[PDB]
Structures are given as C-alpha cells and as structure tokens.
C-alpha cells in the first residue's frame, strides 16, 4: 500500500542511512546443517551488496551495531541463552534480519527491438521485455509474425516460475500483421485478461495496460502481468 512516491522516499532515506551510519554484523553461529559452505557463499554475497551501499561490516558484536544478520531462526531467539548475541541484540532493540530479509532489502535498494514491456505487479518476476527483429518481422508473409510462449517450463520465452496449477506451456503472445499483439490461452487451468477468463485456443486482442492473470484460485500462485506496448514499434511497422 505504499505509493510509488512513498516507496521512493523510503528508499532514498535507507540508502542515506546505509551510506552514512549503518553498521552491520553477520552472526557467525549456525544451527547444525546436513557442505555451511553454501551459506558461506550466500553470506559473502550479502556482504558485498552491503559494501556496495557504502555500509560498514563489523567482525565483532558491538552495541554500535545497527543490524545483525543471521541464518538462525529469528522466531526462536527468546529460547537462546542470555549470552547469545541474538538474545542480547533483541533485548537492546537492535535489528535482527534473516538472510532472506537482507537479500530482500538489498533488492529494494537496487543492488531486435521492444515489442512490449511485461511487468509482474504481484512481485515474483523481474521486469522483462519482449523482443523481435523488425526487418525480419516485416519480411514475414504469414499472418502471425512472432510467437512468445509463457509457462511453467523454464524453456519458454517467458518463465512464469515453478507454480502449482500452471502449465509447461500456459499461454502465448502472438505478433500479428500491422503491429498488433494478441493473447492465446493453451493452459488447462486457465488464463484471465482484465479479470475476464479468455477462451482457450482463441486469439484475443491485447490493449495498453491489459492485465494477464494466471493461477486464479490460489492466492499464493496468483500472477498478474501488465503489458505496456511500445508505440514506436507499430509507428514504424
């Protein structure tokens, strides 16, 4: 519920704090894991991301520390001994972040031609673009010029992720004559366009800001793409 302007202000402030006076400590204790070396790799990735922000990493636990980042469960810190630095950190009202939260934080601080710009507004997928060779496109005589496939399969032109009720080949975006994009559902569980379920194996014309929604029926697998069609493409086609 943060507006674009609010979230931008939120970001500006944190970058400011990170650069000037954040002091991050990485908890060296773990819960036994059944090869520590994998989380040592994800750890050093986090450290470099924070260094990218101009923040200072500490080798020892001070009270000058502003954030501690840990692999151990934050939920169970109250069960640790009083000497444990996670226990001491929380009781002194210090920030205690999970590796996931830290990676999530760093992501939020930014650490052929374009047919359209696909934007997943539910989060899961980064901003991707659809590409097509223009000279090759006008060369084609067939009615359908190019064909992007969306689906559960990471072999598709657009990977929708490993979702429960999706399909290896879920739906398609077809490029037609005269620079028009259209939509084609081939899934078995369904595709939606602006809240309306589209007819399977039937080409529906896409418009500006049209919202493709799949995985309807489970609020976790849900996925909404908004298509922002490039005007220059048709304006030169």
Author numbering: 103 to 136, 139, 141 to 216, 238 to 363
The authors write:
Rad53 contains two forkhead-associated (FHA) domains, as well as two SQ/TQ cluster domains (SCD), flanking its kinase domain. We generated chimeras expressing the HBRCT (Dbf4) and FHA1 (Rad53) domains in tandem and solved the crystal structures of these chimeras in the absence and presence of a phosphorylated epitope derived from Cdc7.
Therefore, we anticipated that we could stabilize the interaction by producing the two domains as a single polypeptide chain. The chimera containing a five-residue linker readily yielded diffraction-quality crystals. The C-terminal end of Dbf4 (residues 216–220) and the N-terminal end of Rad53 (residues 22–29), as well as the five amino acid linker, were disordered in the structure. Importantly, the four complexes in the asymmetric unit had identical interfaces, indicating that the linkers did not constrain complex formation. In good agreement with our previous results showing that the pThr-binding pocket of the FHA1 domain does not mediate the interaction with Dbf416, the complex forms through the lateral surface of the FHA1 domain defined by the β2-β1-β11-β10-β7-β8 strands and the concave surface of the HBRCT domain.
